[PDB]
Amino acid sequence: PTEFLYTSKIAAISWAATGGRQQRVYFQDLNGKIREAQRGGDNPWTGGSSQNVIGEAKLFSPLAAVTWKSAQGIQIRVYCVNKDNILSEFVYDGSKWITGQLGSVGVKVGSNSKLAALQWGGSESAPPNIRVYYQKSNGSGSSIHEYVWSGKWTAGASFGSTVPGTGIGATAIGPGRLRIYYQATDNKIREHCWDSNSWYVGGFSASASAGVSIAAISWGSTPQIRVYWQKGREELYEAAYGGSWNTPGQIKDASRPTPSLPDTFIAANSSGNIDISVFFQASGVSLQQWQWISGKGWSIGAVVPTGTPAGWL
Amino acid sequence: PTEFLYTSKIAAISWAATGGRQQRVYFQDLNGKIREAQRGGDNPWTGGSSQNVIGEAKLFSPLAAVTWKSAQGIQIRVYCVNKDNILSEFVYDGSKWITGQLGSVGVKVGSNSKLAALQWGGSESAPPNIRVYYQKSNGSGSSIHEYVWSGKWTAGASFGSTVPGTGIGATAIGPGRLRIYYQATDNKIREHCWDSNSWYVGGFSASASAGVSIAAISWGSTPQIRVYWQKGREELYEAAYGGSWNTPGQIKDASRPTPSLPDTFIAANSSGNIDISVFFQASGVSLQQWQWISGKGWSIGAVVPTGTPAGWL
Ligand SMILES: CO[C@@H]1O[C@@H](C)[C@@H](O)[C@@H](O)[C@@H]1O
Ligand SMILES: CO[C@@H]1O[C@@H](C)[C@@H](O)[C@@H](O)[C@@H]1O
Ligand SMILES: CO[C@@H]1O[C@@H](C)[C@@H](O)[C@@H](O)[C@@H]1O
Ligand SMILES: CO[C@@H]1O[C@@H](C)[C@@H](O)[C@@H](O)[C@@H]1O
Ligand SMILES: CO[C@@H]1O[C@@H](C)[C@@H](O)[C@@H](O)[C@@H]1O
Ligand SMILES: CO[C@@H]1O[C@@H](C)[C@@H](O)[C@@H](O)[C@@H]1O
Ligand SMILES: CO[C@@H]1O[C@@H](C)[C@@H](O)[C@@H](O)[C@@H]1O
Ligand SMILES: CO[C@@H]1O[C@@H](C)[C@@H](O)[C@@H](O)[C@@H]1O
Ligand SMILES: CO[C@@H]1O[C@@H](C)[C@@H](O)[C@@H](O)[C@@H]1O
Ligand SMILES: CO[C@@H]1O[C@@H](C)[C@@H](O)[C@@H](O)[C@@H]1O
Structure with a gap:
């Protein structure tokens, strides 16, 4: 067994790095702590133990994460909710993990809400712009709400009418250009868009399937967009945009059918042009991922460590 | 969500009672504590919360339990293993829960061992006789070992050659007459027997299926024996002895196929002539049971409460 909480949410980030791409993945342990695992290039994953705690949240808290590089080092923000269902944030400030300012705002989240987040613009010569997406209510037909950081936290938009506790994917497809994916009450995944000064239906x-976990990534100049969804113990789906949308297709391995457990979640990261990881939860309880390689395709990659309880090896 | 640890083992007991049969079921929570839920007659289940802790054990500890009535009240013994893989015992002494004497003996258990236990003879006019079954080693071909209480703890028999971490069912089919069920290396469930002065192959x-969770009960004068087995997300099987063994059959509900989660465990209780519960773990994460009623048959009964984490209703 492991210390990975069954039906924990997952969040993941990636960035380019001299010597190999850096990835971080966040998950919850049996004690409610949020742990980090790390990968550099194709070296084995590290972390995931009780010595890799970055924060804590209510048990079964939703999770989301973003990253950028700043003059102070690598910045990471991990979004979650506390035991009072208040939207909360852990900060890696370039050198250490601390509690971020978002929790003090008092944003109430529906108990079964998921979280998504995106960021654009942050660098060593420009400030970050973060958007966090959440729901206030658990019922069918609830909207998605947005909280905004472009210098200070303030409320943003609300839109959509969703399945209860819908999955939410969020990606900045270009500077200040946002695409948000969610599952509407007809069980269709739908898209909401911001290009300049307004939200519109994409x-x-x-x-x-009703209740799929959703993730979304994007890169490049077209831009390329990939939207992922998965119901636990069903195959992963991808829809791809390269100027137009393709027909969604399954990402699967005939020797390892439907490898996730029931009622589990996914997360995706990307960086470069292009490296993609799509994380899932499997028997073990294990943290697994699909990986994309141009000219090989998709495969299940190395297992991410998630601790070993006392009394076991 | 609930506080029921996914892939927790389960143990259950039952006894006849004026006003309705009493049942207790034991399971592990996310913190490693062993919790109790209670039922009287067909009234709703109670307990299962953080206020119903009876002991603690290593995370994913095996569990077993027995009960009898004594001059001091209802006696319960719950077997588990600690973080050093030492066989341990919690005692309900008729009025309170305390730590029992077995842990001080120093019986090492294989990390992936299951546990079973049986009892006969204990009453308000006779002492109890307890037997606890465990494995020392995790590998294919390991034996089953027995620890014995007939006034003080001492080692008993060892027998069998099993699948790794085999399920173990144990029942006293009559006074000092024991039947032990386990899965041998050919994946067949097999039986070991004691009638008077020796163990023999039944x-x-x-x-x-390789790795099934096993439970066994018995009652009456024939006697009647029932052996249960289940692989997670497969249907429950029962074999029945009433003088001869029948062909095993599935206990299932066409409207709720294979209702347990992957890699989960079962437990059975019985009392009277005859009331039977077979517990399993399902999405929720929930503690469920099959129930037998003469002249209705088998059905899925009321859900057993297993707590609600903070931040959820
Ligand atoms: C150098 O530190 C490593 O990388 C940072 C960007 C953080 O992910 C931190 O938790 C990790 O230990
Ligand atoms: C400087 O403030 C830190 O970074 C900002 C970009 C926000 O993530 C804020 O909540 C956090 O406390
Ligand atoms: C300028 O408007 C703010 O930033 C945009 C990119 C959107 O996130 C919008 O909902 C928000 O109010
Ligand atoms: C111009 O079209 C809009 O932007 C594209 C990048 C896609 O997100 C598409 O679905 C959307 O309707
Ligand atoms: C070139 O292939 C396309 O882009 C890759 C990065 C993957 O998203 C793949 O599933 C898709 O078909
Ligand atoms: C009266 O007390 C109830 O029954 C006893 C036999 C025990 O199961 C105890 O934990 C429970 O609360
Ligand atoms: C009196 O001693 C208690 O009851 C016996 C029957 C055993 O269960 C023993 O380990 C326990 O401490
Ligand atoms: C008398 O022998 C003891 O009791 C029997 C009923 C068996 O449990 C046996 O293995 C044990 O040594
Ligand atoms: C006499 O036969 C023995 O006892 C019966 C009660 C059964 O346990 C049977 O399988 C076993 O071989
Ligand atoms: C009378 O029916 C037999 O005994 C019952 C108590 C159940 O074990 C049932 O599955 C079996 O077929």
Whole structure:
């Protein structure tokens, strides 16, 4: 066994690095702490133990994360909710983990809400712009709400009418250009868009099983967008945009059918042009991922460590 | 969500009572504590919360339990293992829960061992006789070992050659008459027997999926024996002895196929003539049971409460 909480949410980030791409993945342990595992290049994953705690949250808290590089080092923000269902944030400030300012705002989250986050613009010569997406209510038809950091936290938009506790994918497809994916009450995944000065309904839609976990990434100049969804113990789906949307397809391995456990979640990261990881939870209880390689395709990669309880090896 | 640890082992007991049969079920929470839930007659289940802790054990500890009535009240013994893989015992002494004497003996248990226990003879006019079954080693071909209480703890028999971490069912089919069920290295469930002065190989056998969780009960004068086995997310099987063994059959509900989660465990209790519960773990994460009623048959009964984490209703 491991210390990975069954039906923990997952969050993941990636960035380019001299010597190999850096990845971090966040998950919850049996004690409610949020742990980090790390990967550099194709070296074995590290971390995931009781010595890798970065924060804590209510048991079964939703999670989301973003990163950028600043003059102070690598910045990471991990979003979660506390035991009072208040939206909360852990900060890696370039050198240490601390509690961030978002928790003091008092944003109430529905108990079954998921979280998504995106960021654009942050660098060693420009400030970050963060957007966090959440729900206030658990019921069918609830909207998605946005909290905004472009110098200070303030409320943003609300939109959509969703399945209860919908999955939410969020990606900045270009500077100040946002795409948000969620599952509407007809079980179709839908898209909401911001290009300049307003939100509008996007052209993407796809039928999916009720209650799928959703993630989204993007890169490049077209731009390229990939939207992932998965119901636990069903195969992963991807929809791809390269100027138009393709027909969604399954990412699967005939020797390892439907490798996730029931009622589990996914997360995706990306960096470069292009490296992609899609994390899932499997028997073990293990943290697994799909990986994309151009000219090999998709495969299940190395297992991410998630601790070993006392009394076991 | 609940506080029921996913892939927790389960133990259960039952006894006849004026006003309705009493049941207790034991399971592990996310903190490693062993909790109790209670039922009287067909009234709703109670307990299962953080206020119902009876002991603690290593995370994912095996569990077993027995009960009898004494001059001091209802006696319960719950077997588990600590963080050093030492066989341990919690005692309900008729009025309170305390730590029992078995832990001080120093019986090492294989980290992946299951536990079973049986009892006969204990009453308000006779002392109890307890037997606890465990494994020392995790590997294929390991034996089952027995620890014995008939006034003080001492080692008993060892027998069998099993699948790694085999399920173990144990029942006293009559006074000092024992039947032990386990899965041998050919994946057949096999039977070991004690009637008077020696162990011998029994006539029961049945093919089963590798790694099934096993439970066994018995009652009456024939006697009647029932052996249960289940692999997580497969249907429950029962083999029945009433003088001869029947062909094993599935206990299932066409509207709720394979209702347990992968890699989960079962436990059975019985009392009277006859009331039977077979507990399993399902999405929720929930503690469920099959129940037998003469002239209705088998059905899935009321859900057993297993707590609600803070931040959820
Ligand atoms: C150098 O430190 C490593 O990388 C940082 C960006 C953080 O992810 C930190 O938790 C990790 O230990
Ligand atoms: C400087 O403040 C830190 O970084 C900002 C970009 C926000 O993530 C804020 O909540 C956090 O406390
Ligand atoms: C300028 O407007 C703010 O930033 C945009 C990119 C959107 O996140 C919008 O909902 C928010 O109010
Ligand atoms: C112009 O079209 C809009 O932007 C594209 C990048 C896609 O997100 C598409 O689904 C959306 O309707
Ligand atoms: C070139 O292939 C396309 O882009 C890759 C980065 C993957 O998203 C793949 O599933 C998709 O078909
Ligand atoms: C009266 O007390 C109830 O029954 C006893 C036999 C024990 O199961 C105890 O934990 C429970 O609360
Ligand atoms: C009196 O001693 C108690 O009851 C016996 C029957 C045993 O269960 C023993 O380990 C326990 O401490
Ligand atoms: C008398 O022998 C003891 O009791 C029997 C009923 C068996 O449990 C045996 O293995 C044990 O040594
Ligand atoms: C006499 O036969 C023995 O006892 C019966 C009660 C059964 O346990 C049977 O499988 C075993 O071989
Ligand atoms: C009378 O029916 C037999 O005994 C019952 C108590 C159950 O064990 C049932 O599955 C079995 O077929």
